[PDB]
Amino acid sequence: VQCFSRYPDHMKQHDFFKSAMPEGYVQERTISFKDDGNYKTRAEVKFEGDTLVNRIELKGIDFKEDGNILGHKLEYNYNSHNVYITADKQKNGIKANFKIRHNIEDGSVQLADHYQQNTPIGDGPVLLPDNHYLSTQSALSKDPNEKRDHMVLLEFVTAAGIT
Amino acid sequence: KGEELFTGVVPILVELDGDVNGHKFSVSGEGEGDATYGKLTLKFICTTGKLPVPWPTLVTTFX
Structure with missing residues (x-):
């Protein structure tokens, strides 16, 4: 849900994600885990009311x-x-590339290469950006009162790379 | 329209259907996002029992 990324004022004309709203966008990804398998995802991100x-x-x-x-x-x-x-x-959309390094319990790292493609669902005009990046910071935790397999996520995302 | 729909706190819903090497699963997520601060607070629950993959591998798909 990269539509919640903080785009600085001087970079607001580079926000594809928010411009595709309320109709939304289709997000497709290929996540390749080094020396292992791959995840292929297809997502629809849009507004259903508020x-x-x-x-x-x-x-x-x-x-x-x-x-x-x-x-x-x-x-x-x-x-x-x-x-x-x-x-x-x-x-009429965007492409995105990044590497995620998961920490293995022995102290090593599991690389997960991400390739992303987003295209608008609606016919209305969208913002086509210049090259930039999204600085992400995440923290995972558990709800002590929950017995079902779960994950609590706190995430901060800020756009950068254009001055 | 567009950016104007994100000036405040917006409720989020995440629904995933997965299949990893034959292991079928479903996850339901709820929370909110405040784009002005680029903040996301979410809670994901595996509705089919125990998740057959580790939770960190799904964060980017979720979000």
């Missing part, structure tokens, strides 16, 4: 049974990263 909805379909293939993913060898935390955005004027 509520922002993110409907996703995830498909994961070629994963190792006792790899870092299916064997649950990753620590419960998240590192800071940058999402590098570029325009896709041919598809």
Whole structure:
């Protein structure tokens, strides 16, 4: 839900995400885990009344049974990263590339390469940006009163790269 | 319209249907976002039982 990223005033004409609203956008990703499998996602992000909805379909293939993913060898935390955005004027949307480094319990790291593509659902005009990035900072926690498998996420996202 | 719909606190809903190596699962997420501060506060619950993949692997898909 990158439509909640803080775009500085001098960079507001580069906010594709918010300009596609209320009709929204389709977000597609290929997440490739190094020496393991891949996730292929298709999501629809749009407004349903005053509520922002993110409907996703995830498909994961070629994963190792006792790899870092299916064997649950990753620590419960998240590192800071940058999402590098570029325009896709041919598809009236954007493309994004970034690397996520998950911490493994032995002290090593599991690389997850992300390729992203976003296209508007509506016919209305959108903002096609110049090259920039989104500085992300996340923190994961647990609700002590919850017994179901869960995750509490606190995230801060700010756009940068253009002065 | 557009940016004007994000000037304040907006409620968020996340619904995911997954299939990883045959292991089918569903996650429901609720929370809010304040774009003025680029802040996201969300809680995700696996509605099909236990998640067959670690939670950190899904953060970018969620969000």
